[PDB]
Structure 1
Amino acid sequence: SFKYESAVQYRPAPDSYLNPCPQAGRIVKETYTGINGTKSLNVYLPYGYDPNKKYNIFYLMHGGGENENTIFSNDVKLQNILDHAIMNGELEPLIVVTPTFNGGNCTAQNFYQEFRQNVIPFVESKYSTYAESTTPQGIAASRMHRGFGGFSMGGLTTWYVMVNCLDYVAYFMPLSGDYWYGNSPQDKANSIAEAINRSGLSKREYFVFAATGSEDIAYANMNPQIEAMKALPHFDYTSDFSKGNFYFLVAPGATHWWGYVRHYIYDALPYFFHELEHHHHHH
């Protein structure tokens, strides 16, 4: 069974995990209408999905030039990794949603508004998450069971989601993207700190697992931000989320490509959703 490490290291999923698994989760293409017009997304349901059980949910955003289909396309194949990891007990079953910041007036920076108003209620009123209802109250009450992450421009999306949606989301996975709000790393960290202040949340109620590659140009602006965030009292640096709430995984030699980034998800996603979980697990 999964056990937290305090300084988890980069490790790719075995090559066999990139091939289809017999215990395949179902991927459902959905279309909805929101503040940015009619748009689509994909919903990965785990193998064995039972709508009378409750699942954690992770929303995962593509990068620049991509779309809601990329992550489950032949160019990434994340579903194969998810399938194999869940089958082998490395990852607890959960719902994974791949939306898009394309369409209408939407941008990577402003997607959080559509996320709050349209995406969460649409998805979580159709599929069984810990949200008993999808009113603002129902979404907020299930925040410990909701995560957001994304790559590149989708990492930027993640940071804007964090600063504007702490009330709705507890776990964040920014991959190869920095937060564009501010003229210095301190401005950036302070903005995040101010959001945490406003939320009233404790340090045991939000968690950030950031990652990039040592040869990924995102590192240049990410690293300084991470360092500034480390200096804040709001974050306790360690991958052991039973103790702290902030980690930055840097994959040696990895470049700005989903071929690597998919493994960051393999490495990090198993770390999410255990704190205050409703199951009796030892991690």
Structure 2
Amino acid sequence: SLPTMPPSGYDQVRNGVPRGQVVNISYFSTATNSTRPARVYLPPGYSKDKKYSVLYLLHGIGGSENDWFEGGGRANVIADNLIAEGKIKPLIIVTPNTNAAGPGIADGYENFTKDLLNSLIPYIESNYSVYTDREHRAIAGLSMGGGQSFNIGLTNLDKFAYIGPISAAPNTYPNERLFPDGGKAAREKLKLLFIACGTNDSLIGFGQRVHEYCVANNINHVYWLIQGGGHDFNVWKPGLWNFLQMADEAGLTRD
């Protein structure tokens, strides 16, 4: 069953496994009034004749859109291998720069909500062959990125049906702000809420309180703790490996 600890080699390049391509892109953001960078993972065999689902994967504080790839996440390798094992269908993974800083910006990480929704998503949808409905859009991330996944995803259930916060940081909104309707929309529209963290992580308390709220308010979700896990990729990689499969099972890649 899932979630579970991944098998050795899940994150290593395997001989004979088709590799997707990671491309660097830039887009104009009305949120920052500047050109912003991002990376896009195109699955092996990517073709404009078919539509793909999209996962927006967010990095941590001070990080970049490279963190989830050669920065330690190895997201492309993990995805490549899962596709080859028939555990997930191909999908596009977008890694943005989560600090939408700019002129007169109070909080760049908060400003990122507008950047993602009004600039990045529209750019991706007009430049790649993808579905544009909530049932084919997921959001996940680590630390500050996990906090943004909670924040953006739960307050925009009309746009995301799968949410995966890993080791969510303090920027995570209070429970009342994440579920202003007592969890009505979450129970009926959210296909997957995957919360994961290492037990040795100092920030464990944030995902923990969201989990406690979901239990008390009967909100279905998956809470997974990696025993002895720290604030590092030895927790974030297994988190992604599991999220990809669970989101796929939940319908993320449904035709």
TM-score scaled by structure 1? 0.79
The residue number in structure 1 matching 2:125 is 124
SS in 2 for 1:17: coil
Give the number of equivalent residue pairs: 247
SS in 1 for 2:56: strand
Aligned ranges for residues 220-235 of structure 1 at < 5 Å? 220-233=205-218, 235=219
CA contact (8 A) 2:88 2:248 kept: no
How far is 1:28 from its partner? 1.2
Farther off after superposition, 51-60 or 67-76:
67-76
How far is 1:232 from its partner? 1.2
How far is 1:60 from its partner? 0.4
**Which one of the candidate residues 262, 265, 280 is aligned to 2:240?**
265
The residue number in structure 2 matching 1:63 is 60
The residue number in structure 1 matching 2:178 is 192
CA distance in 2: counterparts of 1:202 and 1:253, whole angstroms:
30
CA distance in 2: counterparts of 1:32 and 1:102, whole angstroms:
14
How far is 1:9 from its partner? 4.0
The residue number in structure 1 matching 2:143 is 152
CA contact (8 A) 2:148 2:171 kept: no
Corresponding letter in the other structure for 1:203: R
Structure 2 unaligned residues grouped into runs of 5+? none
The residue number in structure 2 matching 1:18 is 12
CA distance in 1: counterparts of 2:172 and 2:71, whole angstroms:
34
SS in 2 for 1:272: helix
How far is 1:279 from its partner? 4.8
CA contact (8 A) 1:81 1:266 kept: yes
How far is 1:231 from its partner? 1.1
CA contact (8 A) 2:197 2:204 kept: yes
CA contact (8 A) 2:145 2:168 kept: yes
CA distance in 2: counterparts of 1:268 and 1:160, whole angstroms:
18
CA distance in 2: counterparts of 1:43 and 1:277, whole angstroms:
18
Corresponding letter in the other structure for 2:64: N
Aligned ranges for residues 36-185 of structure 1 at < 5 Å? 36=32, 37-105=34-102, 107-131=108-132, 142-178=133-169, 180=171
SS in 2 for 1:203: helix
How far is 1:48 from its partner? 1.3
CA distance in 1: counterparts of 2:214 and 2:5, whole angstroms:
25
Q: Cα RMSD over matched residues?
A: 2.3
SS in 1 for 2:19: coil
CA contact (8 A) 1:154 1:177 kept: yes
SS in 1 for 2:92: strand
The residue number in structure 2 matching 1:134 is none
Q: Quickly say closer, same or farther: Cα 1:77–1:121, change in 2 above 3 A.
A: same
User: Percent identity, aligned pairs only?
Assistant: 26
Q: Quickly say closer, same or farther: Cα 1:20–1:68, change in 2 above 3 A.
A: farther
How far is 1:274 from its partner? 4.4
Structure 1 unaligned residues grouped into runs of 5+? 132-141, 183-187, 237-245
